[PDB]
């Protein structure tokens, strides 16, 4: 529980230090979620998955992907942005669009399922600007306190003595751009992959190959994006 236990228990070691400026805020978010339940509203993903992106090592991140907020359908969000459990079908529409672009950009076959954990295990941070949502109500937790947490995460990533490429999908994600100003960091911005915006510039954006060209130009290893 975010309300009950400290960052050193909840997230990976580098992340616990990176998020120290927002320790109280994370506890505050736990209190917010408690209040939602007391009031008769639910949230997604499950409490134990809310901070899941911060359970993969901070020092190993080479690419950051940021979306808006979690999937609003119960059974979809898993605490890694855009990912679903390997048994979920059909795929949510944002994910189908991401995979469409993945095939077009990289030439790989469509993935077997919607599980993006391989990316997380290979140094891709799968973040959302806001880390919870009320079921069936996209953007319902906007402005409730998560933004300070994800702002802190990005600042910390940008301050590392390491290369970083950011991929910012959509308007809420794009508000992290000022913080990404650092010489060791470069940002790709595009419209969100949702059907609401994908045709404004998500399709054809080639984020995966662009990220790898940027990494190699900073002397970093490219991401192996291939999913099974």
Ligand X SMILES: NC1=NC(=O)NC(=O)C1
| 94 part of the interface to ligand X, by CB under 6 A | yes
* Displacement of CA 177 from its chain's centroid (Å): 15
Q: Is 141 helix (H, G, I), strand (E, B) or coil?
A: coil
Task: Decide if residue 171 touches Cl ion (CB under 5 A).
Answer: no
b vs e for 42-70, b when ≥16 Cβ sit within 10 Å of the residue's Cβ?
ebbbebebbbbbbebebeebbbbbbbbbb
CA 86 to chain centroid, in Å, comes to 18
Yes or no: say if 96 and 84 are a contact pair by the CB < 8 Å rule: no
The only residue of 41, 93, 171, 200 in contact with Cl ion, by rule CB under 5 A = 41
User: 92 near 196, Cβ under 8 Å?
Assistant: no
Window 97 to 136, contacts with Cl ion (CB under 5 A):
135
Tell me which of 24, 69, 87, 100 is the catalytic residue: 69
> Residue 41's binding partner, choosing from ligand X, Cl ion, none, with beta-carbon cut-off 5 to 8 A by kind?
Cl ion
Report the residue from 42, 93, 177, 200 that binds Cl ion according to the rule CB under 5 A. Answer: 42
Give ∠ CA 38-139-207 in degrees, rounded to 5: 135
Q: Which does 190 bind (CB under 5 to 8 A by kind): ligand X, Cl ion, none?
A: none
| Piece of the chain touching ligand X by CB under 6 A; list 3-11, 63-71, 180-188, 199-207 | 63-71
Task: Enter the tokens of residue 151.
Answer: 């702002």
C-alpha angle with apex 184: 23 to 175, nearest 5 degrees? 55
Is 5 an interacting residue with respect to Cl ion (CB under 5 A)? no
How far apart are CB 221 and ligand X at their closest, in Å? 26
Q: State yes or no: is 87 an active-site residue.
A: no
Give the interface with ligand X as residue ranges (CB under 6 A): 67-71, 81-82, 92, 94, 128
Catalytic residues: 69
Give the interface with Cl ion as residue ranges (CB under 5 A): 41-42, 135
């Amino acid at each position: 529980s975010m309300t009950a236990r400290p960052l050193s228990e909840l997230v990976e070691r580098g992340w616990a230090a990176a998020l120290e400026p927002v320790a109280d805020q994370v506890a505050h978010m736990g209190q917010f979620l408690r209040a939602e339940i007391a009031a008769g509203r639910r949230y997604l993903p499950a409490g134990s998955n809310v901070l899941r992106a911060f359970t993969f090592p901070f020092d190993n991140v080479r690419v950051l992907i940021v979306g808006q907020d979690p999937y609003p359908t119960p059974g979809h969000a898993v605490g890694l942005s855009f990912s679903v459990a390997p048994d979920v079908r059909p795929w949510p529409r944002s994910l189908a669009n991401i995979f469409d672009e993945y095939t077009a950009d990289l030439g790989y076959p469509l993935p077997s399922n919607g599980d993006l954990t391989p990316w997380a295990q290979r140094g891709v941070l799968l973040l959302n600007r806001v880390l919870t949502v009320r079921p069936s109500n996209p953007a319902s937790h906007r402005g409730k306190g998560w933004e300070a947490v994800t702002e802190c995460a990005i600042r910390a990533l940008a301050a590392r003595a390491a290369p970083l490429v950011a991929i910012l999908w959509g308007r809420d994600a794009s508000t992290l751009k000022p913080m990404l100003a650092a010489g060791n960091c470069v940002a790709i911005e595009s419209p969100h992959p949702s059907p609401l915006s994908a045709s404004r510039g998500f399709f054809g954006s080639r984020p995966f190959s662009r990220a790898n060209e940027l990494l190699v130009g900073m002397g970093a290893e490219p991401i192996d994006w291939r999913l099974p």
